Design an enzyme around this catalytic site. Sequence first.
Site, short mmCIF file in Angstrom:
data_model
loop_
_atom_site.label_atom_id
_atom_site.label_comp_id
_atom_site.label_asym_id
_atom_site.label_seq_id
_atom_site.Cartn_x
_atom_site.Cartn_y
_atom_site.Cartn_z
N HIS A 185 2.69 -5.70 2.99
CA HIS A 185 2.57 -7.05 3.77
C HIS A 185 2.53 -7.80 2.67
O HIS A 185 2.26 -8.48 1.73
CB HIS A 185 0.78 -6.74 3.31
CG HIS A 185 0.33 -5.76 4.29
ND1 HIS A 185 -1.44 -5.29 4.04
CD2 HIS A 185 0.65 -5.16 5.26
CE1 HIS A 185 -1.26 -3.66 4.71
NE2 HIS A 185 -0.23 -4.15 5.55
N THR A 229 -7.14 -5.23 5.51
CA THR A 229 -7.64 -4.43 5.10
C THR A 229 -7.82 -4.51 3.47
O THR A 229 -8.38 -2.62 3.70
CB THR A 229 -6.34 -3.32 5.55
OG1 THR A 229 -5.08 -3.98 4.23
CG2 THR A 229 -5.41 -4.07 6.36
N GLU A 258 -0.61 2.14 6.08
CA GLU A 258 -2.01 1.55 6.76
C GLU A 258 -1.94 1.69 8.20
O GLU A 258 -1.71 2.16 8.99
CB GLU A 258 -1.90 0.39 6.14
CG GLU A 258 -2.91 0.34 4.80
CD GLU A 258 -3.57 -1.00 4.64
OE1 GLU A 258 -3.64 -1.92 4.68
OE2 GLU A 258 -4.69 -0.33 3.29
N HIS A 305 0.56 -1.11 -0.44
CA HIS A 305 0.08 0.14 -0.33
C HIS A 305 0.91 1.68 -0.03
O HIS A 305 1.94 1.69 0.43
CB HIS A 305 -0.92 0.20 1.12
CG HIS A 305 -2.23 -1.09 1.38
ND1 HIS A 305 -3.10 -0.98 0.65
CD2 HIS A 305 -1.50 -2.54 1.52
CE1 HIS A 305 -3.12 -1.86 1.73
NE2 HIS A 305 -2.73 -3.44 1.88
C1 LIG Z 1 -10.09 -8.90 -3.90
C2 LIG Z 1 -8.77 -8.77 -3.06
C3 LIG Z 1 -8.32 -7.59 -3.04
C4 LIG Z 1 -7.68 -7.14 -2.02
N1 LIG Z 1 -6.95 -7.86 -1.08
C5 LIG Z 1 -5.95 -8.16 -0.78
O1 LIG Z 1 -5.09 -8.89 -1.56
C6 LIG Z 1 -5.84 -9.24 0.04
C7 LIG Z 1 -5.19 -8.51 1.50
C8 LIG Z 1 -4.46 -7.87 2.43
S1 LIG Z 1 -4.10 -7.38 3.77
N2 LIG Z 1 -3.78 -5.56 3.11
O2 LIG Z 1 -5.25 -7.17 5.04
O3 LIG Z 1 -2.86 -8.06 4.29
C9 LIG Z 1 -5.07 -10.06 2.92
CL1 LIG Z 1 -4.34 -10.21 4.54
C10 LIG Z 1 -5.12 -9.99 2.43
C11 LIG Z 1 -5.67 -10.65 0.74
S2 LIG Z 1 -5.85 -11.49 0.03
C12 LIG Z 1 -7.49 -11.94 0.06
C13 LIG Z 1 -8.80 -11.49 0.44
C14 LIG Z 1 -9.93 -12.27 1.46
C15 LIG Z 1 -10.96 -13.08 -0.09
C16 LIG Z 1 -9.73 -12.70 -1.57
C17 LIG Z 1 -8.54 -12.75 -1.53
ZN LIG Z 2 -2.33 -4.91 2.76
#
Ligand SMILES: CCCCNC(=O)c1cc(S(N)(=O)=O)c(Cl)cc1SC1CCCCC1
Ligand SMILES: [Zn+2]
Length: 257
Positions: A116, A195, A103, A93
């Site tokens: 991340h 997030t 974040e 991010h």
């Molecule tokens: C549609 C996906 C949108 C973008 N997000 C992510 O790639 C993502 C961000 C985080 S974060 N920013 O908290 O690190 C985490 Cl832990 C897991 C996922 S991937 C996952 C989200 C749940 C089901 C779809 C893929």
């Molecule tokens: Zn993230």
Amino acid sequence: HWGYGKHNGPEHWHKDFPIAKGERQSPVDIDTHTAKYDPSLKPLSVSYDQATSLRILNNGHAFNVEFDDSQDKAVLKGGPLDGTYRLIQFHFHWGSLDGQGSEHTVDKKKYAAELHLVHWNTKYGDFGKAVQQPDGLAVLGIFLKVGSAKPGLQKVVDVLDSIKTKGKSADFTNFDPRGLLPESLDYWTYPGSLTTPPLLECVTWIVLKEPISVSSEQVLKFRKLNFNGEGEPEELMVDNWRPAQPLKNRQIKASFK
Ligand SMILES: CCCCNC(=O)c1cc(S(N)(=O)=O)c(Cl)cc1SC1CCCCC1
Ligand SMILES: [Zn+2]
């Protein structure tokens, strides 16, 4: 659909994803004076020697560097965790300006960007099952500040021209995520959430105290990415961060001092 603007940005997410207003949302401000040192926390064990990156993807919100997670190859353990968590992807991010982008915040300080590294608990067998569990994921968060270049980042930066727009991907093998880690593994930890939508409350957050430095030229390359797809009107991929959320009934623990 959700994204990062005035009408589809973080403040709107709760209409599609009501957990946005939940009890363990991320990110949070890390008030360093209030975080308590926990002598029971273990050193973090980051075992990335056999990581198999496969590909990099512009998913329209960020870019993901993906790994082969079908064997134990790149795993996070120790620290606050029980059991073994396997690396599936990393992403960042970042801001439109160096003064914003992270974040998590540290005593309200915003870093230029935040990395991340997303891992899922092998007791749940795959990522999609893991995200349905309160201890399903462990995310290692690493702050980026602008200064000296990060040499281990350059292979990522140089491929971004090829994935400028949403839905583009590229072969991205042999990338070693050890080159993105700071010297110290001292960390803060707390229970939280993804997030991004769907904002599931499945994450043990492990946020490293020591930022990495990246150059102005490296972060400028992040800011040339696009949130749009090819052949659409250009929207620079910048400010793809969710603000700090209420800590509510949570304690942030420190592994140090
Ligand atoms: C549609 C996906 C949108 C973008 N997000 C992510 O790639 C993502 C961000 C985080 S974060 N920013 O908290 O690190 C985490 Cl832990 C897991 C996922 S991937 C996952 C989200 C749940 C089901 C779809 C893929
Ligand atoms: Zn993230």
